[PDB]
Amino acid sequence: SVLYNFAPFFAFKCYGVSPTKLNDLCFTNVYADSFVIKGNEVSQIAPGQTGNIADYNYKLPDDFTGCVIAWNSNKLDSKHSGNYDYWYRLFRKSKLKPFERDISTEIYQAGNKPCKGKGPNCYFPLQSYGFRPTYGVGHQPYRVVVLSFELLHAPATVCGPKKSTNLVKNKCVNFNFNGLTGTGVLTKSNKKFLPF
Amino acid sequence: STIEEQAKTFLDKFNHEAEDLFYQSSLASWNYNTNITEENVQNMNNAGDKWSAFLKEQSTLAQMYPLQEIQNLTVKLQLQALQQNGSSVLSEDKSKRLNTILNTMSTIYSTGKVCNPDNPQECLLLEPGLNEIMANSLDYNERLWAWESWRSEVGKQLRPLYEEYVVLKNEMARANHYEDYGDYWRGDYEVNGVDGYDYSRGQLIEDVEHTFEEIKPLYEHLHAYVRAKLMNAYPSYISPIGCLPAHLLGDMWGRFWTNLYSLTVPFGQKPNIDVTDAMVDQAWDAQRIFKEAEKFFVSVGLPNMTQGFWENSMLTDPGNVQKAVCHPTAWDLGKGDFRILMCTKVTMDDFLTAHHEMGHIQYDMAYAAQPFLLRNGANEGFHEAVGEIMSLSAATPKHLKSIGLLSPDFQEDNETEINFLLKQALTIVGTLPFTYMLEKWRWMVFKGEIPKDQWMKKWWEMKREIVGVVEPVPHDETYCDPASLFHVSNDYSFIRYYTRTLYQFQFQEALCQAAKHEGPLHKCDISNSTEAGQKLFNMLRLGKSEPWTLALENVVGAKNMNVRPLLNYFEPLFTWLKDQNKNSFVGWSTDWSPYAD
């Protein structure tokens, strides 16, 4: 609900789950990942879609997953000398099984050369996005939160908020106090339901 | 056994650690040009230098991959460059002497002052005064004193200086496998290995001599006109059958002939439509000129101007004492950063500029999706051309009409068409004959077809010949008449101006048919079409990825320049242009010399 408490969230594609009923139904549990990236790549992050972000830096599967949320963060994230803090892996070795992870700096190599490489290059996978405030709206920094729900063997505990209706008293009314159901007049009382 | 792939990576880095260096080197330059101070100069001295660093080294680590194995042309090209050591390979102590030369001459031409020929007081400086003196009065003398005030003077200073660079410049070339600097210079077009779309490095020369020997017929009648209309405002002087001498012609050296619409005016009783006034009547402000342009482009369905344009572009004079350089010029610091810097002064000579300098930004926004080392234009003159066609459809008696600006009360007639042409045909057909020579001469001199002790002769020889001009006074072998203008003394190839004048009409007549024309083509107006719209983008997109040869075919419809289309724009004129000569003479009597007399 307070999810609408974000700006025009540049995205919210709910591949997999009905975007609606979001609060209507519950699943075992839900993780929420997050990272900063340029806006010319906020699409790679999507079932099947390819490219660098999905290749050595964060590959989703195809499973519903749940949804995605993106917002431009320049305002505070960008700088004026180059926010040279956010990084990326230009090249790993192969790719990642949906939702893997690799952080080892591991200066890239391979090439059976004195410095196994691609012609005196011995490149290093980590490069610095380096944002600035005057850039386009395709090289400006966007923020993302990937919503991963799931329904294991046990229940949907996390689950969600349900509404009331206020008590009536002295009038046939069907009901659902806690989780017990039935139809009857809900008068006052005189019992001492022990504290539990 | 990856000989490539072991390099498709070398690029993958460059492509990232360059853009960042280039952004912070083009920025610097705006800041100066916009705000003129001192620290700003320095502030750019660093990054305006740094970039260099990156470059040189990457070239080192670029030949490390013998191009021979590369086969994906995309990479055979991104590499084609980088490697190019070009200079630097040249001798050291010698590379020094060269670095020197340039300066000397490139400087001389700058402050070069002309003291009075009758007083050490009237020392006119070119920018203001030397120029006026030329495109101003009519009286003889000062015109000669000025054609004398430079040649055997501000150029003699460099006469042997030109004879200098020709030595080392050709050395460097040799090394880099290029008979003459001209063979280096004649390369932007050399397209190798593409099956049918191939093009040589010499084929060009011939296509020129062809296209040109087709124009003579027109040009011939134009020197025919003036030659006589320059016998009216002038007394016993211009021999009625010889060559229009220098001084009395147009500008200084006389590249263009524009400064003349007066002396020659088909029917000097016509309106010469000028929407300047009306601009000052609707109260048209500056931010209008640009919003109009933007539209023209969006009408034909092309991207709107971004939000970084309307918020970062110096679109007026230099604010306060904010000394600014006032040169219309659209920038592209990369990263979506597109900007314009023109001091738009309310008028109809700036409303066309806008449409001319937004096309630069509209091309620069299509190729924006290509490797940094492939973002430019197929060949040298596809960049202007693709933004002049706009300053052609913009000032159409229709557009200005249909645009709620030009009094729709247009009493349009023949003696205005017949008249708007002698204007657009004194600065796009009188410049052609001159663009050749210069190039020829050097293209030769370089190759070594002339020995210094003769260089001079040719100039004048190929001046009464190809063009039709005689030396007001006889000139000495130690004068660099050729080398006495910016380009000549600032190493700039000058054929991007003969191939931009012939690709503009091949683009007009093509994106014209598409929008359903049918009448005088000077009357074309693509505004509001959409078929032509796509016509262009399908070329503006390929940036420099594919050969220029085929880039045309996408549009135009062939793959080699054509003088036919251009000879149609003024086709109207070539009628009244023979009926106006009628019995007068045509052709030049090479002999007659206003000095050899």
From Swiss-Prot, chain A:
Disulfide bonds join 14-67, 26-159, 115-122. Residues 83-91 are annotated as: Immunodominant HLA epitope recognized by the CD8+. Residues 1-175 are annotated as: Receptor-binding domain (RBD). Residues 90-124, 153-175 are annotated as: Disordered. Residues 72-142 are annotated as: Receptor-binding motif. Changing residue 124 to L: Increased resistance to neutralizing antibodies and human covalescent sera neutralization. Changing residue 124 to S: In strain: Lambda/C.37, Omicron/BQ.1.1, Omicron/XBB.1.5, Omicron/EG.5.1. Residues 38-40 are annotated as: Integrin-binding motif. Residues 1-161 form the BetaCoV S1-CTD domain. Binds to host ACE2. RBD also interacts with the N-linked glycan on 'Asn-90' of ACE2. Cleavage of S generates a polybasic C-terminal sequence on S1 that binds to host Neuropilin-1 (NRP1) and Neuropilin-2 (NRP2) receptors. Interacts with host integrin alpha-5/beta-1 (ITGA5:ITGB1) and with ACE2 in complex with integrin alpha-5/beta-1 (ITGA5:ITGB1). May interact via cytoplasmic c-terminus with M protein. May interact (via N-terminus) with host bilirubin and biliverdin, thereby preventing antibody binding to the SARS-CoV-2 spike NTD via an allosteric mechanism. Attaches the virion to the cell membrane by interacting with host receptor, initiating the infection. The major receptor is host ACE2. When S2/S2' has been cleaved, binding to the receptor triggers direct fusion at the cell membrane. When S2/S2' has not been cleaved, binding to the receptor results in internalization of the virus by endocytosis using host TFRC and GRM2 and leading to fusion of the virion membrane with the host endosomal membrane. Alternatively, may use NRP1/NRP2 and integrin as entry receptors. This is Spike protein S1. It comes from Severe acute respiratory syndrome coronavirus 2 (2019-nCoV). The lineage of its organism: Viruses, Riboviria, Orthornavirae, Pisuviricota, Pisoniviricetes.
UniProtKB/Swiss-Prot annotation, chain B:
Its EC number is 3.4.17.23, 3.4.17.-. The keyword Cytoplasm applies. Changing residue 19 to A: No effect on interaction with SARS-CoV spike glycoprotein. Regulated by chloride and fluoride, but not bromide. Chloride increases angiotensin I and decreases angiotensin II cleavage. Inhibited by MLN-4760, cFP_Leu, and EDTA, but not by the ACE inhibitors lisinopril, captopril and enalaprilat. Highly potent and selective in vitro ACE2 inhibitors were identified. Changing residue 337 to A: Strongly inhibits interaction with SARS-CoV spike glycoprotein. The lineage of its organism: Eukaryota, Metazoa, Chordata, Craniata, Vertebrata. Keywords: Carboxypeptidase, Cell membrane, Cell projection, Chloride, Cytoplasm, Disulfide bond, Glycoprotein, Host cell receptor for virus entry, Host-virus interaction, Hydrolase, Isopeptide bond, Membrane, Metal-binding, Metalloprotease, Phosphoprotein, Protease, Receptor, Secreted, Signal, Transmembrane, Transmembrane helix, Ubl conjugation, Zinc. Changing residue 541 to S: Slightly inhibits interaction with SARS-CoV spike glycoprotein. The active site is at 357 (proton acceptor), 487 (proton donor). Changing residue 375 to K: Increases very slightly the interaction with RBD domain of SARS-CoV-2 spike protein. It is a single-pass type I membrane protein. Changing residue 13 to D: Abolishes interaction with SARS-CoV spike glycoprotein. The chain holds residues 19 to 615 of 805 of the full protein. This is Angiotensin-converting enzyme 2. Residues 1-597 are extracellular. Changing residue 72 to Q: Increases slightly the interaction with RBD domain of SARS-CoV-2 spike protein. It catalyses: angiotensin II + H2O = angiotensin-(1-7) + L-phenylalanine; angiotensin I + H2O = angiotensin-(1-9) + L-leucine; bradykinin(1-8) + H2O = bradykinin(1-7) + L-phenylalanine; neurotensin + H2O = neurotensin-(1-12) + L-leucine. Changing residue 375 to A: Slightly inhibits interaction with SARS-CoV spike glycoprotein.
